[PDB]
């Protein structure tokens, strides 16, 4: 509700007035120095900061600045002073316009006590034209207390939804996280969907993101869909929420294609083959006119700006960043007094940096594609200084940090096509500008005393047309059947990455069945599972993991890996087709071992 509000602080109580703020329309406007970023609560709902002018001393809660009224030189204003422990009083004066060093500002020569800082300044019209900007005491001397406010904004903020529901229409939402968000926009469109009685699907990249949607949509009739279920259908006003990989593995497994006519994919830039595949299908369903869909992303496929916009200002520092352990030179890493996010190209690389900064006495959390859904909640819960992470953190991973150290690198999987066909982990090579923009994205979403900093190294590379994922999604995609007998294609811009012809990867009969199984139960990469299945090898049959050249022998910690089979024999792990991803990290390999023995 609109008006004037006192700002009380306690814990342990405590209870003293720090300043005054103004709620107008639906947004709260007070001084920066009063809250300094701290959250607020009242009779209904908490308040999150989104806009703040650091030096200019003013902050906005629940969207950008809203106060649209200006003072004019030589006039008459009214400071509605809300003294701490005292009743509101209007104070009128003739406000002087004095010289600063930037230019010229208007102010009032009035003195009120600390904890009044942020009282409204009212014009003859009645609309608030500024805030009581302490201070005070400017040279020279006495006062003066500045008439402090920003320029009209614009946009910022705040709704309402365009009719993006009309079938055969696809929308990209260049959502800015920090303004709100899956907090404000997603329930808003979901609500509107139910009113239009549309078969709705929400697609969230990780599980823990979907879990964050679940609560952001508490009350709403929404059912999470376990991937261990081929299809679920209740036949009532219900919104399915699932992981991207759930959607595609369902489209693969079950023949019961539910005819959603609305599909909202959050973080639609995920280049995981499952996600690419999903985007492929959903796109074709839009084309059918059988569906309309929304793709939420800060960096839509195609986008190449490594420095997009943010709701909070980011400093972009370019430096040298270590790849192994360090000693001297790189003190700025350690010297920093705040929470940091660090992107490493691989899990192995991760372990160095951690071990190295662990010596400095820094509480570091490690993140990888597997450990993520088990390690990310710890970044909220426990106290820490450094989260080292792989590029998994590009998918809606929200951290409360101030710095991202991003050596701008990664490993990309590649299929070499000379003699034997195999997948290797190329690099570390430079990331995509999109992926850079995304890593940087983690930072600079909360207004902060110091602007958040993106500390990077090197220029990204656009071309990833040899990435396995694209051709891996093609084989994923064109093994999903449709009731209209149409072959699904890669989604628009993403098409130009695959040089393959449409459908060529199609697997007939119950080879197709194996290909699904290998991915779903045996838990193998798409390329691998494809080559094994299309060889007519049954899912139980494992004796292919032992027929390779000298070259194909898998290694673990510099030693030949030798496994104990189901029928019981020690055999050197030597796949026919070599896919690097199965041994790229211990847990992957550990898991592949279990498969190869027959215990899966």
């Amino acid at each position: 509700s609109e008006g004037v509000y006192r700002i009380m602080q306690r814990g342990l109580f405590g209870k003293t007035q720090v300043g005054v703020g103004i709620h107008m329309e639906g947004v709260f406007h007070t001084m920066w120095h009063v809250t300094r970023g701290s959250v607020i609560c009242h009779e209904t709902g908490r308040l999150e900061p989104s806009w703040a002018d650091v030096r200019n001393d003013m902050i906005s809660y629940g969207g950008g600045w809203r106060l649209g009224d200006k003072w004019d030189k030589e006039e008459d204003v009214q400071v509605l002073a809300i003294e701490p422990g005292k009743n509101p009083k209007h104070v009128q004066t003739k406000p002087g316009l004095f010289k600063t060093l930037t230019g010229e500002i208007g102010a009032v020569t009035l003195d009120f006590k600390p904890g009044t800082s942020g009282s409204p300044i009212i014009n003859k019209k009645g609309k608030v034209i500024g805030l009581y900007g302490n201070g005070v005491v400017t040279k020279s001397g006495d006062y003066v207390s500045a008439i402090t406010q920003a320029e009209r904004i614009g946009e910022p903020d705040y709704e309402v939804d365009e009719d993006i529901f009309r079938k055969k229409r696809l929308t990209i939402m260049d959502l800015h996280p920090g303004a709100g968000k899956t907090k404000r926009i997603l329930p808003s469109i979901v609500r509107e969907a139910l009113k239009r009685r549309l078969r709705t699907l929400i697609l969230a990249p990780t599980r823990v993101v979907a879990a964050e949607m679940e609560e952001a949509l508490r009350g709403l009739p929404i059912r999470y869909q376990t991937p261990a279920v081929k299809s679920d259908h209740t036949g009532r006003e219900i919104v399915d929420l699932m992981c991207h990989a759930t959607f595609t593995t369902r489209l693969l497994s079950s023949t019961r294609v539910p005819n959603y006519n609305l599909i909202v994919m959050d973080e639609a830039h995920f280049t995981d083959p499952c996600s690419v595949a999903a985007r492929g299908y959903i796109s074709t369903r839009v084309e059918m006119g059988e569906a309309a869909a929304i793709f939420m992303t800060a960096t839509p496929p195609g986008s190449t700006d490594p420095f997009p916009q943010s709701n909070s200002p980011i400093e972009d520092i370019e430096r040298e960043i270590p790849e192994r352990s360090w000693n001297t030179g790189f003190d700025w890493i350690t010297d920093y007094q705040g929470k940091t996010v660090w992107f490493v190209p691989s899990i192995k690389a991760g372990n160095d940096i951690a071990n190295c900064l662990r010596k400095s006495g820094k509480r570091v959390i490690q993140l990888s594609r597997k450990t993520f859904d088990t390690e990310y909640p710890k970044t909220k819960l426990t106290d820490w200084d450094f989260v080292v992470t792989t590029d998994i953190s590009e998918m809606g991973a929200n951290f409360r940090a101030g710095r991202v150290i991003d050596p701008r690198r990664c490993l990309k999987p590649v299929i070499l096509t000379d003699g034997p066909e195999r997948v290797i982990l190329a690099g570390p090579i430079p990331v995509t500008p999109a992926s850079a923009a995304q890593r940087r994205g983690r930072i600079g979403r909360n207004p902060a005393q110091e602007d958040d900093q993106y500390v990077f190294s090197g220029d990204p590379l656009k071309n990833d047309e040899d990435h396995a994922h694209w051709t891996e999604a093609k084989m994923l995609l064109d093994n999903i059947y449709t009731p209209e007998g149409i072959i699904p294609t890669l989604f628009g811009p993403e098409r130009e990455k695959t040089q393959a012809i449409d459908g060529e990867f199609r697997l007939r009969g119950e080879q197709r069945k194996t290909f699904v199984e290998l991915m779903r139960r045996g838990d193998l990469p798409v390329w691998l599972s494809y080559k094994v299945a299309s060889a007519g090898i049954s899912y139980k049959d494992r004796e292919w993991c032992f027929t390779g050249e000298r070259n194909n022998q898998i290694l673990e910690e510099n030693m030949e890996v030798e496994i104990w089979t189901r029928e019981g024999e020690k055999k050197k792990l030597r796949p026919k087709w070599l896919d690097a991803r199965v041994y790229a990290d211990p847990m992957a390999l550990k898991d592949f071992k279990e498969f190869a023995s027959g215990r899966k």
């Binding site: 809300i82 009128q92 009645g126």
Partner: peptide
């Protein structure tokens, strides 16, 4: 949280 609100006033010019 540790900060709170208390509605003390409404915005209007004194005629």
């Amino acid at each position: 949280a540790d900060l709170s609100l208390e509605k003390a006033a409404n915005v209007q010019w004194d005629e």
